[PDB]
Amino acid sequence: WGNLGHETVAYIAQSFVASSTESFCQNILGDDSTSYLANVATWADTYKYTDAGEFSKPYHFIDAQDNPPQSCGVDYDRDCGSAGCSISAIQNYTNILLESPNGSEALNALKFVVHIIGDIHQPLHDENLEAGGNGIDVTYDGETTNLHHIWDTNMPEEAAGGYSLSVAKTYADLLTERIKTGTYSSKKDSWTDGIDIKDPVSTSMIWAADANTYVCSTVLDDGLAYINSTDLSGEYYDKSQPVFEELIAKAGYRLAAWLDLIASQPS
């Protein structure tokens, strides 16, 4: 996601974590504000364009070597790659927080976890094709951009009605209410199925596999001829909106569950 998506995911997680988890995170971050997770949710997307953080560029993705929209699937060993991926990063940074939450690596580990659980839910962060669709130029609202960019940024900002932190917060609140009482309120009971703090790879692969299915069902189900030739801010946006909204909701809810587990400090 772009910044709005990440911040929204983070605010959703803040609505579901336990008070002790809240303290656990605020103390690591040095941030006692009511935006403590949202404030650090975009940090990894800066870090990756620094000399020191450049190594972490691949940690945003797992490049599923599938064939959408006919066939989707993601596999850890096939797809992660030798430079690491979202899944291997979740394992590493989770384990740092399990082993040494008060150590000097914990701050960045937590910033990564908040960010990367977000990214695992963006279907095109879970797809190899044309660099996650970055290579697929498209028209959106009369302007040239690319398919990746509209999923990260244009469509979520359009749905949220902007891009400020306060807009992310409002959006998060809308989605959080959908989880508590609204359209996701039955489904969500099964959103943490399979979660296992002792098996971060399996846990995050469930999430990524779930998200990757939408590459076939929604992102590319119209086919590339349609995608390459049609302004995607019309019916394509309309079809995409319920999907990215549910995925952002899943990401926030799962992020909260995972933070609760981390803060519980299992031996």
Ligand SMILES: Nc1ncnc2c1ncn2[C@H]1C[C@H](O)[C@@H](COP(O)(O)=S)O1
């Ligand atoms: N799934 C992906 N696999 C590989 N590279 C990707 C993927 N998604 C996007 N990219 C590339 C496109 C850009 O060069 C770069 C940064 O894209 P972002 O910052 O919009 S996430 O990563």
Ligand SMILES: *[C@@H]1O[C@H](CO)[C@@H](O)[C@H](O)[C@H]1NC(C)=O
């Ligand atoms: C995190 O990853 C690094 C680099 O691969 C590795 O050396 C280290 O053992 C890992 N740390 C944890 C806590 O798993």
Ligand SMILES: *[C@@H]1O[C@H](CO)[C@@H](O)[C@H](O)[C@H]1NC(C)=O
């Ligand atoms: C759509 O455009 C991409 C390049 O962005 C190209 O790889 C693909 O073949 C095109 N497909 C069609 C059907 O036009």
Ligand SMILES: [Zn+2]
């Ligand atoms: Zn992102």
Ligand SMILES: [Zn+2]
């Ligand atoms: Zn992206």
Ligand SMILES: [Zn+2]
């Ligand atoms: Zn990212």
